Design a protein around this nucleic acid. Structure first.
Ligand SMILES: [Mg+2]
Ligand SMILES: [Mg+2]
Length: 1240
RNA sequence: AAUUUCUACUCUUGUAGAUGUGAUAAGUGGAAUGCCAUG
DNA sequence: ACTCCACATGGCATTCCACTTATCACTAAAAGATCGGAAG
DNA sequence: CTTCCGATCTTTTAGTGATAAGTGGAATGCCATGTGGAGT
């Protein structure tokens, strides 16, 4: 009988606690006068300068390695094709093996162990790779093998400024070893080549060959654009899109050339662009030819490749010049404005714009491409000018319409024909517009310039002037000056003169926009090192004089002590432990042996002495260094750890590959005995009570043995020190004493502590000291942030503050990773039938909506989480989102919205977790594609689709409730672990512990009472005869004489060509045009039943705004206008389709589409209800405006309710699942059939 | 209207909830401006 | 107190911003470089 | 006047089994369409 309290101590999690350090006593004088802060600031600055200098070596080596790659890519393409054909486990394993094989084949060039290279080149690559992650980068032991980097004297000084400090780059070495490795890291060069870029290139090749097979002219078009751009002159376009061409496109230059082939080289702005592959395909589609209809079915976009991991991008496009400071942009703009003033732009522009009143307008022309701008700016709509032109061309006349459209689409038009088509109103609006634009330009030129671009007003005035100048340039670009059509000579010459004068303003606008929108400078913290190469990397007492980090405890206040280097040497400061009743500090005594898996072979088998001993003779060697008794290394022990092959004989890989269970068991037992002897004999571990360990032959696998052994090697004890010694040490300057501090260590605190304060207090509590459940970690780091009753706004930023980031580890007694975590949760849900569901719907109108259901589908609690603790967070997020949108267009400080969303979700996660604990339920979420949620966050960044799964999963991974006692599960020492260990979103399955993912579709627009959905898809009824065929497919519809509602019948075996392909459980439906009378809810508000909300499509091409519709009222109005009698209750459908008028059939289809729309939304009045087009067997049509608590209230509440029921389906199928596994997704047919069978 | 830091506050020199840091790399999405086209 | 109206989209290019996603470390001790004093 | 070497400070190192990712596509929906401005 498993229990809900059993979900604890399953896996380790690592957390970082952050505290402010208060300098205690005279330590601030000693840390300031020795210049540690300034030296560490200079060290950080030199590191930031030196990082790209070092990166040049890695980029050069990666280039020189990747130009030598010569592989055959047919096997990987075949593997991907076979995986895409059928998604099964065996083909997935084959694809994983092939990807690993190619990732190793790429990695062999970096190592220098490939057959297809010479021995000298391989030796050079091996000797380059050997010193690539060491101090050989600094002292030139590997730089002279390359030579191409060509470091100058300042770069050499920067490189040698880190003398005896190379281990500062240790984390950089770990970061850069991920790149040159083939261990399936996403941030690796071979993984990027094999798994990221190659599927994109294969899809591009398949797209190209399909496109060429469909139409032959696109081959000539692609050859012409490839010749015109100027890339790959030796390879044809049939050879570029081929598998052997992927031996290139590995270095960044070839990738950028391929991307410029796809996208197109761009010249300077104001000059015609050379099109790309995607651009010319979009141009061919937009022509609306028959070939466009051919292409539209095909997938018509080539996918560009990704950047290489280190090499920077370069392009053939016009990289436009940038300014460097506010002084330069103001001085350059003042010079440009002065130049425009003495050249006298404005009087000759006004002469041009008043010359139209006394000139023959037949010798002037308007550019064809910009007539839409004039139409939008001058008249009520963009279509008015071209509609007038079309009517005028008709008035002076099948094929003639095409001739008129072809004349209007590409040939310039004179202004006299414009003035004949439109009349006096366009003339007066035109001169008014030029007068307004010239007035704006004159006002901009007379207005002085601000000095600096610091505050918003000084940037807004600059934008106001420069946009007016751009508007005058746009107005001046209206006229056509080219010789292809007739034009007055002197006017054209002077017009191109003033346009040539005005040309650089458009580039000036872009330069000022690129400068003015930069992020403002803000002071940031930097890592302190106290002139120590390895400061605070470990708390151990053996390393306490080299690391310097020692913790203390003083009557509940926690202190940190740093002993600096004295005259450049490590003075081993020692403390004498005294009697416990003496007043003073309690020193923390750390005892650790970091990991048995890495430290048993290092201190036993991988010594230089042992390896040198075993390459001449097989006699066992006795080791005496750091051993109380001489330990013996035998021959078979050394060959167990060095088997001259990748799998070792005592590990699970050998047993899986070979199957020799007996040999694996013998090797494992020998290794356990050897580790026991080693831990018995080593001085560091000779006092460890190893009697609690199991015998050697009982362990199933070595990882279990290490997971059991590791908690025994960690220990903390506290020793008393006299206060006089510590005070003398901190006064003399031999010790820097800081107090670990936050809000909860203040004088007057009353309430419950912070969660991290609970972690810190529970780490050093006596019960955790007796048995370690929370582990204090190394690699602590110190940061210094400078300067950026008496209650003061932003008091914390008024002075410099020392920070202290310290990692901790929770659930230390557990394993590193859980052992089949989902099996335990599935077993617990299998043995517990009555388990609720806390299903969640995410959106933007309602940010989070939840519904809690029981096992029988009833509603326990439904509630919108737009407001928590009397704060409507959705309105605040909407205001912030609108402020950011309006601020990024006025060149303001955009700011951050992540903080407010995190604040809102901190409340939401607490409410959801509180319901989880109080109901002992599961949480079902909707499985949304990353593209969809990124698109919806792009449209409105108020939304919380992302940043909600991550916080919920990370909270449930280590859930500590503040109220609960520490010894009880759920306390600070026994956290709840209700989710699987979070590694990455890609590797997450459909179930993560108690959190469930169900498919998204058919959860909102579904009737909760009977499970009806709209069966049609409205894209297939675009034409009138299809509307006739859709109309004759229905059985009947007639007016009920006693209830006043039209009852339309449906049989599901009809209109299969218009259905979306989901036959429901029911064979028939009763679609009802309900009587539009007044109904009252529980609160007494009136509403009209059957009301629908539909956007207006009166223009037949655009989506207008919403309007209220009444299907019964408009239906009876249509039928009374037609005069068709219906009071006898007879079927009207054959009486209706007997006429050939398109208006009646069109409004019939419109009414049917409107009545079948379940979701009715109107953001202006705040209405999100659902009305049901069909009738329940109880004789009540559903309407959520009744607001009965047994049924959902809004549409998002309905969405949450059907997320809950979709997870109810999974839990219902779990009870009959003998394999303790869930379904492999839920098909929409299965879900609809299940819900419609449950309702009926 | 105080906070390691974020969010909502002020019976309380503080309250309630949350908070994995550092480093590196990549991608996505907005906005402005150009070019070719579409309604 | 009513009613009309606000140009929109597709493919690329440049710059700027914000935000997300995916790896590594959470480390004592063995090995190697350096140096001040002893010995020749 | 020159050479060695034991102390001491940086620097590099050692490396387990999680076994996962369970598939089901063939297309849908998953959510919403600027909401706010003006004259008369
Ligand atoms: Mg939903
Ligand atoms: Mg929803």
């Amino acid at each position: 009988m498993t229990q809900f309290e059993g979900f604890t101590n399953l896996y380790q999690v690592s957390k970082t606690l952050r505290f402010e350090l208060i300098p205690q006593g005279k330590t601030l004088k000693h840390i300031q006068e020795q210049g540690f802060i300034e030296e560490d600031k200079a060290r950080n600055d030199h590191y930031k300068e030196l990082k790209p200098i070092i990166d040049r070596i890695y980029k050069t080596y990666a280039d020189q390695c990747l130009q030598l790659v010569q592989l055959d890519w047919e096997n990987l393409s075949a593997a991907i094709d076979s995986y895409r054909k059928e998604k099964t486990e065996e083909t997935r394993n084959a694809l994983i093996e092939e990807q690993a094989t190619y990732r190793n084949a790429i990695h062999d060039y970096f190592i220098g162990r490939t057959d297809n290279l010479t021995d000298a080149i391989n030796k050079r690559h091996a000797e380059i790779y050997k010193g690539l992650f060491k101090a050989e980068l600094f002292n030139g032991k590997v730089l002279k093998q390359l030579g191409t980097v060509t470091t100058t004297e300042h770069e050499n000084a920067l490189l040698r400024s880190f003398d005896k400090f190379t281990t500062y780059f240790s984390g950089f070495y770990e970061n850069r070893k991920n790149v040159f490795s083939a261990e399936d890291i996403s941030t690796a060069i071979p993984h990027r080549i094999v798994q990221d870029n190659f599927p994109k290139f294969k899809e591009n090749c398949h797209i190209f060959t399909r496109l060429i097979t469909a139409v032959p002219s696109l081959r000539e078009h692609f050859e012409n654009v490839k010749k015109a751009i100027g890339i790959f002159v030796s390879t044809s376009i049939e050879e570029v899109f081929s598998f052997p061409f992927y031996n290139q496109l590995l270095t960044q230059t070839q990738i950028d050339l391929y991307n410029q082939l796809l996208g197109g080289i761009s010249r300077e702005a104001g000059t015609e662009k050379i099109k790309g592959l995607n651009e010319v395909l979009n141009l061919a589609i937009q022509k609306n030819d028959e070939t466009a209809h051919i292409i539209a079915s095909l997938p018509h976009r080539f996918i560009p490749l990704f950047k290489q991991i280190l090499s920077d991008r370069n392009t053939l496009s016009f990289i436009l010049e940038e300014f460097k400071s506010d002084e330069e942009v103001i001085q350059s703009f003042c010079k440009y404005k002065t130049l425009l003033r003495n050249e006298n732009v404005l009087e000759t522009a006004e002469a041009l714009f008043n010359e139209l009143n006394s000139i023959d307008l037949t010798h002037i022309f308007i550019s064809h491409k910009k007539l839409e701008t004039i139409s939008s700016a001058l008249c009520d709509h963009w279509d008015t000018l071209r509609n007038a032109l079309y009517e005028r061309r008709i008035s002076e006349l099948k094929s003639a319409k095409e001739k008129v459209q072809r004349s209007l689409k590409h040939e310039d038009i004179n202004l006299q024909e414009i003035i004949s088509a439109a009349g006096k109103e366009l003339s007066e609006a035109f001169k008014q517009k030029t007068s307004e634009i010239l007035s704006h330009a004159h006002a901009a030129l007379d207005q002085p310039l601000p000095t600096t671009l610091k505050k918003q007003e000084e940037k807004e005035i600059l934008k106001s002037q420069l946009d007016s100048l751009l508007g005058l340039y746009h107005l001046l670009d209206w006229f056509a000056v080219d010789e292809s059509n007739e034009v007055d000579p002197e006017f054209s010459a002077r017009l191109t003169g003033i346009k040539l004068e005005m040309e650089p303003s458009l580039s000036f606008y872009n330069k000022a926009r690129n400068y003015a929108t930069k992020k403002p400078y803000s002071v940031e913290k930097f890592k302190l090192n106290f002139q120590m190469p390895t400061l605070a990397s470990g708390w151990d007492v053996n390393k306490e004089k080299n690391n310097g980090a020692i913790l203390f405890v003083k009557n509940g206040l926690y202190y940190l002590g740093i002993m600096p280097k004295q005259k450049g040497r490590y003075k081993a400061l020692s403390f004498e432990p005294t009697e416990k009743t003496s007043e003073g500090f309690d020193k923390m005594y750390y005892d650790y042996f970091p990991d048995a898996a890495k430290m048993i072979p290092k201190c036993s088998t991988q010594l230089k002495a042992v390896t040198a001993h075993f390459q001449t003779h097989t006699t066992p060697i006795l080791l005496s260094n750091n051993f109380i008794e001489p330990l013996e290394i035998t021959k078979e022990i050394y060959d167990l750890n060095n088997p001259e092959k990748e799998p070792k004989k005592f590990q699970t890989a050998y047993a899986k590959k070979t199957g020799d269970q007996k040999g694996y068991r013998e090797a494992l037992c020998k290794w356990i005995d050897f580790t026991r002897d080693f831990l018995s004999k080593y001085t560091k571990t000779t006092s460890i009570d190893l009697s609690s360990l199991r015998p050697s032959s009982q362990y199933k696998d070595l990882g279990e043995y290490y997971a059991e052994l590791n908690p025994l090697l960690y220990h903390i004890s506290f020793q008393r020190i006299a206060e006089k010694e510590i005070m003398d040490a901190v006064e003399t300057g031999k010790l820097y004493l800081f107090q670990i501090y936050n809000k909860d260590f203040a004088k007057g605190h009353h309430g419950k502590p912070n969660l991290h304060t609970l972690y810190w207090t529970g780490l050093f509590s006596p019960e955790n000291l007796a048995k370690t459940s929370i582990k204090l970690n190394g690699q602590a780091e110190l940061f210094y942030r400078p300067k950026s009753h008496e209650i003061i706004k932003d008091r914390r930023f008024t002075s410099d503050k020392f920070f202290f980031h310290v990692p901790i580890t929770l659930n230390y007694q557990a394993a590193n990773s859980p052992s089949k975590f989902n099996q335990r949760v599935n077993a617990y849900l299998k043995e517990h039938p009555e388990t609720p569901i806390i299903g969640i719907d995410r959106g933007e109108r309602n940010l989070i909506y939840i519904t809690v259901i029981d096992s029988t589908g009833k509603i326990l609690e439904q509630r919108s989480l737009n407001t928590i603790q009397q704060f409507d967070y959705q309105k605040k997020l909407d205001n912030r989102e609108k402020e950011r949108v309006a601020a990024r267009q006025a060149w303001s400080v955009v700011g951050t919205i992540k903080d407010l969303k995190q604040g809102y979700l901190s409340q939401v996660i607490h409410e959801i977790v509180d319901l989880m604990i109080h109901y002992q339920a599961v949480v079902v979420l909707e499985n949304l594609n990353f593209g969809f949620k990124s698109k919806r966050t792009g449209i409105a960044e108020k939304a919380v689709y992302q940043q909600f799964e991550k916080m919920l999963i990370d909270k449930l991974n280590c859930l500590v409730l503040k109220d609960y006692p520490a010894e009880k599960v759920g306390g600070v020492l026994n956290p709840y672990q209700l989710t699987d260990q979070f590694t990455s979103f890609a590797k997450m399955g459909t179930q993560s512990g108690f959190l469930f993912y169900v498919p998204a579709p058919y959860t909102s627009k579904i009737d909760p009472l009977t499970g009806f959905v709209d069966p049609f898809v409205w894209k297939t009824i675009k034409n009138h005869e299809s509307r006739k065929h859709f109309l004759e497919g229905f059985d009947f519809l007639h007016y009920d004489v006693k209830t006043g509602d039209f009852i339309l019948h449906f049989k599901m075996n009809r209109n299969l060509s218009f259905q979306r392909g989901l036959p429901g459980f029911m064979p028939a439906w009763d679609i009802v045009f309900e009587k539009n009378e007044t109904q009252f809810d529980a609160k007494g508000t009136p509403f009209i039943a059957g009301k629908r909300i539909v956007p207006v499509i009166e223009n037949h091409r655009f989506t207008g705004r919403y309007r209220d519709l009444y299907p019964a009222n408009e239906l009876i109005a249509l039928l009374e206008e037609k005069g068709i009698v219906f009071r006898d209750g007879s079927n009207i459908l054959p009486k209706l389709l007997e006429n050939d008028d398109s208006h009646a059939i069109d409004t019939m289809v419109a009414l049917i589409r409107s009545v079948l729309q379940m979701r009715n939304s109107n953001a202006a009045t705040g209405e999100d209800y659902i009305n049901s087009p069909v009738r329940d067997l109880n004789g009540v049509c559903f309407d959520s405006r009744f607001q009965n608590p047994e049924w959902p209230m809004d549409a998002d509440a309905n969405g949450a309710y059907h997320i809950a029921l979709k997870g109810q389906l999974l839990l219902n199928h779990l009870k009959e699942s003998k394999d303790l596994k869930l379904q492999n997704g839920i098909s929409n047919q299965d879900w609809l059939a299940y819900i419609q069978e449950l309702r009926n």
